[PDB]
């Protein structure tokens, strides 16, 4: 078994029998050849995945931090719930349905 | 420009024509022929499905109610 490496990391400008695959004609092959070729899920290599969880968490903490700010400081409601005469009992499907606001609590 | 359309259908080159292996007459006149004729017969085959029979009863069933006003009063 040769070293298990994606062909993504093989030189594109190197001499290849199959340039589209970046493989030499009789080149030895891993037993995962089927999922180690060019038409495989691209392997992103920006950073170690250990750091990735930390960096994304900072944004999540920022999202939580901003949300906490709004909760403590946000204006109260201005307009009263609309008053509908009769409560729209009939028009909204009868008593067996959600009704409108009609002299209820607030 | 735009090239004239070309290609060898069934792989038969322009010089020659397609040669039969003997399956064609049975497949087109027998296999596909029979099914097409069968298609004609089916449009005449009488409707014997449980939906159709139950539509009629249920259509009568609702007629003895407000829904589905009957065409002919009893």
């Amino acid at each position: 078994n040769p070293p298990r490496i994606k062909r993504q990391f093989r030189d594109p400008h190197a001499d290849w029998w199959d340039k589209q695959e970046r493989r030499n004609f009789g080149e030895p092959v891993h037993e995962d050849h089927d999922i180690l070729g060019m038409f495989s899920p691209y392997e992103y290599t920006w950073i170690t995945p250990g750091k990735g969880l930390f960096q994304i968490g900072l944004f999540i903490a920022s999202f939580l931090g901003l949300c906490y700010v709004v909760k403590l400081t946000y204006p109260d409601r201005v307009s009263y719930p609309r008053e509908f005469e009769g409560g729209l009992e009939r028009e909204l499907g009868g008593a067996g349905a959600v009704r409108a606001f009609l002299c209820l609590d607030d | 420009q735009y090239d004239p359309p070309t290609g060898w259908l069934w792989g038969v080159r322009p010089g020659e024509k397609y040669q039969n292996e003997g399956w064609e007459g049975p497949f087109f006149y027998g296999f596909w022929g029979s099914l097409i004729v069968f298609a004609i017969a089916y449009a005449y085959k009488p409707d014997t499905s449980i939906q159709t029979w139950a539509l009629e009863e249920a259509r009568r069933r609702l007629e003895a109610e407000g829904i589905l006003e009957d065409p002919n009063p009893t």
Binding site: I35, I47, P49, G52, I56 | -
Partner: protein, 85 residues
């Protein structure tokens, strides 16, 4: 949950025109930061704090990274375990 009448009346005027204020304002900083100074953006890029924030957002919040490695490559290895072991 009707909010149509409150959308036009109860909202203060400042909030109604607030996106207009931000649109005309925040654009000119971009016009100021490029073709007028073209230095602050470069200074912010090369800082260690600023380097990663460029890379992190460029690379799509690393979401596909977290998708390929821990979703689809996982499927491709469960298939590998089942069909070999």
């Amino acid at each position: 949950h009707e909010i149509m009448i409150d959308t036009e009346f109860a909202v203060p005027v400042l909030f109604k025109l607030l996106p207009f204020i931000f649109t005309i304002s925040f654009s000119v900083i971009a016009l100021t930061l490029s073709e007028l100074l073209s230095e602050l953006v470069i200074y912010f890029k090369f800082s260690r704090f600023g380097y990663n924030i460029f890379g992190f957002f460029n690379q799509r919040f690393l979401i596909e990274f977290f998708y390929n490695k821990y979703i689809t490559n996982l499927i491709l290895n469960l298939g590998g375990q089942i069909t070999k072991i």
